[PDB]
Design a binder for this molecule. Structure first.
Ligand SMILES: [Zn+2]
Ligand SMILES: [Zn+2]
Ligand SMILES: [Zn+2]
Ligand SMILES: [Zn+2]
Ligand SMILES: [Zn+2]
Ligand SMILES: [Zn+2]
Ligand SMILES: [Zn+2]
Ligand SMILES: [Zn+2]
Ligand SMILES: [Zn+2]
Length: 257
């Protein structure tokens, strides 16, 4: 089983997942000197007011907050996107130390964590068919830095003790994802992949410029989770990020100057 450990980590994923060395892998370093502004990028439209959260779960790699995506309740439109992409889940990647944890980097700066709000293209009818396509998904990536507590994150933090180990889940209704956004929606964008196996090259990445602030007590709560299921040996869920991959023949476009 792939993982983030010594013998099953990112450097070994190519064995079972050869697309790991493909042409559009994520994440990537964003060099703010070469990611040039592009005036034709429309502004990004985020509609989360009717978001309906269902459950929260530890799948052994991170924890996902899943949403009802049966209808256009919470959607992302605009920017580089054609059409309408529905929110299906969010999750985070984070470090064992404050100086690392993000997947994307900005001029090689690593952040303490990165939020991924995952959305699929309604043009394909369901998530399962969307991930098979180049334009199947859009992931909105938000950096986290340590500082002041993020009130909107608290409901997440408070339930983490109930899903400590793999396979555990809890009911998780009425969570409002707008409480996880920064104030500004300026972004970079490029075409890439899922950052975990199976690493499909199906994602339009949209990463925000402005990070959110979370408290060290909030991030410590992330580091108390386990990769293992109950009654296996404890392996703390930390450093569940993949490092930057080669940009190859791709351009990263900025929405701001
Ligand atoms: Zn292990
Ligand atoms: Zn090899
Ligand atoms: Zn540079
Ligand atoms: Zn320069
Ligand atoms: Zn797994
Ligand atoms: Zn669904
Ligand atoms: Zn992710
Ligand atoms: Zn229930
Ligand atoms: Zn138990």
């Amino acid at each position: 089983h792939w993982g983030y450990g010594k013998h099953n980590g990112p450097e070994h994923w190519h064995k079972d997942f050869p697309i790991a060395k493909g042409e559009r892998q994520s994440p990537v370093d964003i060099d703010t000197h070469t990611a040039k502004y592009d005036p034709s990028l429309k502004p990004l439209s985020v509609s989360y007011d009717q978001a309906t959260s269902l459950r929260i779960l530890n799948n052994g790699h991170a924890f996902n907050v899943e949403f009802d995506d049966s209808q256009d309740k919470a959607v992302l439109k605009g920017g580089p996107l054609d059409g309408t992409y529905r929110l299906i889940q969010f999750h985070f990647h984070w470090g064992s130390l404050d100086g690392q944890g993000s997947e994307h980097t900005v001029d090689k700066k690593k952040y303490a964590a990165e939020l991924h709000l995952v959305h699929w293209n309604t043009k394909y009818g369901d998530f399962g068919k969307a991930v098979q396509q180049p334009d199947g998904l859009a992931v909105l990536g938000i950096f986290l830095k340590v500082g002041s507590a993020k009130p909107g994150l608290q409901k997440v933090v408070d339930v983490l003790d109930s899903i400590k180990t793999k396979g555990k889940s809890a009911d998780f209704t009425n969570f409002d994802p707008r409480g996880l956004l920064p104030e500004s929606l300026d972004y970079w964008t490029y075409p890439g992949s899922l950052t975990t196996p199976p690493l499909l090259e199906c994602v339009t990445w949209i990463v925000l410029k402005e990070p959110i602030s979370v408290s060290s007590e909030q991030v410590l709560k992330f580091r108390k989770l386990n990769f293992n299921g109950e009654g296996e040996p404890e392996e703390l869920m930390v450093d569940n990020w993949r490092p930057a991959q080669p940009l190859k023949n791709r351009q990263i476009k900025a929405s701001f100057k």
